[PDB]
Amino acid sequence: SGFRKMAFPSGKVEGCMVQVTCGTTTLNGLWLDDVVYCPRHVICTSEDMLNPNYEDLLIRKSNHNFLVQAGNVQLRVIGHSMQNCVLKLKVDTANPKTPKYKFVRIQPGQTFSVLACYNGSPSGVYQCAMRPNFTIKGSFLNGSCGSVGFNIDYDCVSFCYMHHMELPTGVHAGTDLEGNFYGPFVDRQTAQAAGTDTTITVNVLAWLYAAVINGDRWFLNRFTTTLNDFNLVAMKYNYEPLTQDHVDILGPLSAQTGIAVLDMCASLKELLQNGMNGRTILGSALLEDEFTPFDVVRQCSGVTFQ
Amino acid sequence: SGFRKMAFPSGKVEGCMVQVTCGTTTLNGLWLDDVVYCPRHVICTSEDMLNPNYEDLLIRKSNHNFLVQAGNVQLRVIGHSMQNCVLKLKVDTANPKTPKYKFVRIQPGQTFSVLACYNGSPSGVYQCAMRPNFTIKGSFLNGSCGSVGFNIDYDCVSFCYMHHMELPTGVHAGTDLEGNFYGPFVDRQTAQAAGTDTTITVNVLAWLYAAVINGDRWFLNRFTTTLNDFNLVAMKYNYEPLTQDHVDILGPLSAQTGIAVLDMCASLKELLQNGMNGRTILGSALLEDEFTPFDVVRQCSGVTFQ
Ligand SMILES: O=C(c1cc(=O)[nH]c(=O)[nH]1)N1CCN(c2ccc(C(F)(F)F)c(Cl)c2)CC1
Ligand SMILES: O=C(c1cc(=O)[nH]c(=O)[nH]1)N1CCN(c2ccc(C(F)(F)F)c(Cl)c2)CC1
């Protein structure tokens, strides 16, 4: 029993983190095989941040402008290239701790673990969701750029996020590992703001099922509803609309609890219209939307990895 | 003078198109160096479309299950792998017509050219925009899967789209060239629908500038406005909000016409509230939103390629 904000074990990622220094700027890199990946704004100085011309800035650099350290060992940079907003540093030594990996781009609503790092050294691990406005609500201080987000599928690390910047509202923006930003953000210091966020409805439903599994049942009721009647109320409270595909994803959780999805939607409808009335669900006084159906199954049924 | 829906010259892409057959299914592939890229649903039969398990389906295939033809020449498949929703077919011969290329992911509102193909043979070229709901309004018939979208930057082809499917409303969905879908779509036959589309405001403004450059001035007026007052009206008509970054992008067009962006916004505000009154702009009776500021500069000032 129990329900916690649970991250993936980070061991397989910790061994890939390195420190990258260019000039007086130091941030984190990801060392896989003989390539080190890091944000390209490592090559920017103060004069360049407002309107960087990255092709120009990179052409004026040589391999010896890049200092790469893995703990004590310094890695010799023998080549460099740019792929979108990510810099790829070819090094002379392939990381012997390279796990089986792949680069995947995630969708809004999906969760992943973040290994926050400073000076190439892992500092902490936490779980977060990609928000519908393509930001994450992370926890990052100065020096954290190049920290990565990941999921673990069996033996395979799926890298999905590299951290680039903090926006004025205190939320965070970055790229996939091919250097393509999540959301309409750019790596220059301009006045960019995240759009309107919404609540991830399929995730709230998954969390309500987790509550039932753990003995929280006070919000249930006898009624049922239709997708269209529910979505009519959800849009009024800035909730993402619910699809038939969402209903199918929640299948394993309705089966385990014997509570139909549209039955559970009727409870959610009541909670949206009446509030919590000072009661809590799984130790929270708000509706939580950063657990996917898969996260709930993983934690309430059991799945491990290497 | 003049203003047309103008696509990029397609020659450099036509020489990369091949035909891929697996079983009784034939679609188009992109042949760059010694790799052929194509949609992975080429390995699906009728029984698999509802719930494909692509890892299973691919493990039961061998290299000789894949027939690749470039015109008459058959290409020998010596290896195969899957990257997200794209299949990568290693072949024995590197395409001697491989141009300088890169794989880029585009943002909503950006435009690109589509080379529609059938049986590996180019059929037509047209220009379209990635909509805010991550679909495109293309023109595609049966057999068009694997057709690609591209931009040309100087000598370099930037591939940004591969066609996978048509949605029930008649709009189109696909991936970038790393196999990651644009939008929340999946390559299985389920009931997926595009979300609400909006009008790309910065593109409408660019088009109004193109009109002024070409002698259409009847919609102009003396007033001016602020971003917040304009965005207040725009959101009421399902227009994307306008940012300061958008204002900066439009800079070259305000300079050439001597009409400030916020001046032009006041004209747009009037057109939204009063309509066209039976008059046309650049031969259209509707506000066009599929020309970026860059497209207008390219066509109204002049830029060519190799
Ligand atoms: O390390 C942090 C940090 C991260 C965080 O999440 N929170 C926090 O407080 N600090 N930095 C802030 C972002 N920064 C940066 C440098 C250059 C550029 C560019 F592209 F314009 F050249 C940009 Cl866009 C950002 C590097 C330093
Ligand atoms: O060629 C066209 C076509 C394209 C178009 O844009 N318009 C049009 O009319 N036809 N096809 C329709 C899509 N199709 C397909 C096959 C398998 C799957 C999957 F993933 F489930 F296995 C899917 Cl999702 C789609 C292949 C054939």
Residue-wise DSSP of A226-251:
-HHHHHHHHHHTTBPPP-HHHHHHTH
Q: B274 CB contacts (<8 Å, ≥6 apart)?
A: none
Tell me how far the alpha carbon of residue B185 lies from the centroid of ligand 2, in angstroms: 13
Contacts 24+ apart (CB under 8 A), A44-51: A49/A188, A49/A189, A50/A188, A50/A189, A50/A190, A51/A188
CA B9 to chain centroid, in Å, comes to 15
CA distance B57 to B50: 13
Measured CA to CA in angstroms, residue B245 lies from A166, B202, B207, B229, B261 at distances of 18, 10, 17, 17, 12
Residue of B nearest to A102 (CA): B83
CA distance B85 to B180: 6
CATH number of A201-301: 1.10.1840.10
Residue in B104, B184, B248 nearest the CB of A84: B104
- Check if A190 contacts B (Cβ < 8 Å): yes
The CA-to-CA distance between both ends of chain A, in Å, stands at 23
Indicate the pairing of strand B66-70 with strand B17-22.
antiparallel
Method in brief: X-ray
Length of chain B: 306
Q: At what angle do helices B201-213 and B261-274 cross, to 10 degrees?
A: 100
SS3 A109: coil
- Of all protein residues, the one whose alpha carbon is nearest to atom 11 of ligand 1 is A142
The CA-to-CA distance between both ends of chain B, in Å, stands at 23
Ligand 2 in contact with B142 (CB < 6 A)? yes
CATH number of B11-91: 2.40.10.10
Q: What residues of A are in contact with residue B102 (Cβ under 8 Å)?
A: 83
- Check if A224 contacts B (Cβ < 8 Å): no
Q: At what angle do helices A261-274 and A201-213 cross, to 10 degrees?
A: 100
**Strand locations in chain A (E):** 17-22, 25-32, 35-39, 66-70, 73-75, 77-83, 86-91, 101-103, 111-118, 121-129, 148-153, 156-166, 172-175
SS3 A277: coil
SS3 A191: coil
Residue in B84, B105, B107 nearest the CB of A104: B84
Cβ(A67)–Cβ(A21) below 8 Å: yes
Tell me how far the alpha carbon of residue B52 lies from the centroid of ligand 2, in angstroms: 14
Measured CA to CA in angstroms, residue B258 lies from B212, B262, B298 at distances of 10, 12, 18
Residue from A285, A292, A288 nearest A113 by CA: A292
Q: A226 CB contacts (<8 Å, ≥6 apart)?
A: A262
A245: closest CA of chain B, how far (Å): 7
**Backbone region of residue A120 per phi and psi (left: phi > 0; alpha: psi in -120 to 50; beta: other values):** left
Final resolution, Å? 2.1
Tell me how far the alpha carbon of residue B164 lies from the centroid of ligand 2, in angstroms: 6
CA distance A141 to A48: 22
Token pair listed for B62: 């061998």
Half-sphere exposure of A56 (CA within 13 A, CB side): 6
